[PDB]
């Protein structure tokens, strides 16, 4: 309930504050991973088959910079709102929400 | 490519429940009128001249 809740709130009610903090978190996450030789090597290898032959490292900060609370809100609502979930558990799942409940959690009437 | 009629309808009116509801209010209105019109017509047809609406002539304004 709380999680889905968070999703929804996200694509309707994001505040610049909130997005700006996550922004910065991202930078760090993305800089600190690259500490050490192994880490840099994997980014460089995998980056090339993934994103092709670019190393968007310095770009990032730029891209990350274009982040706006509206940007984050519109981008999240493509993928989470009204969209149908993919849910797996490995019980005690006896209380796990009925597929339709989970589903209705991706839109906002109430709750 | 273009969005199926439904997809069009969807993205314009049903994403936001505000819109959705607005729709339904509007629709309820429009619909009531057409229904009545059509459904009254249909019913009067089945009783041609049987109803006062048909029969007012006789004693009206001479």
């Amino acid at each position: 309930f709380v999680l889905q809740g968070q999703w929804m709130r996200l694509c309707t009610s994001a505040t610049e504050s909130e997005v700006l903090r996550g922004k910065n978190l991202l930078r760090n996450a993305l800089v600190s991973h690259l500490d050490g030789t192994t880490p840099v090597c994997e980014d460089i290898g995998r980056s090339l088959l993934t994103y092709g032959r670019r190393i968007p490292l310095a770009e990032w900060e730029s891209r990350i910079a274009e982040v706006d609370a509206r940007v984050v809100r519109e981008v999240c609502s493509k993928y989470f709102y009204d969209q149908c979930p993919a849910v797996a558990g490995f019980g005690p799942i006896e209380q796990l929400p009925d597929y339709n409940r989970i589903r209705s959690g991706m839109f906002w009437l109430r709750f | 490519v273009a969005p199926t009629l439904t997809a069009r309808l969807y993205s314009l009116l049903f994403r936001r429940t505000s819109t959705f509801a607005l729709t339904i209010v509007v629709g309820a209105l429009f619909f009531e009128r057409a229904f009545d019109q059509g459904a009254d017509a249909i019913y009067e047809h089945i009783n041609e001249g049987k109803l006062w609406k048909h029969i007012k002539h006789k004693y009206e304004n001479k």
Partner: peptide, 22 residues
């Protein structure tokens, strides 16, 4: 935030409703 735009379609709805319904 999104509340004006949402409160503005919620506004409309009530209005249309009364207008019509009543």
């Amino acid at each position: 935030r999104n509340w004006v735009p949402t409160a503005q379609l919620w506004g409309a709805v009530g209005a249309v409703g009364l207008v019509s319904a009543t």
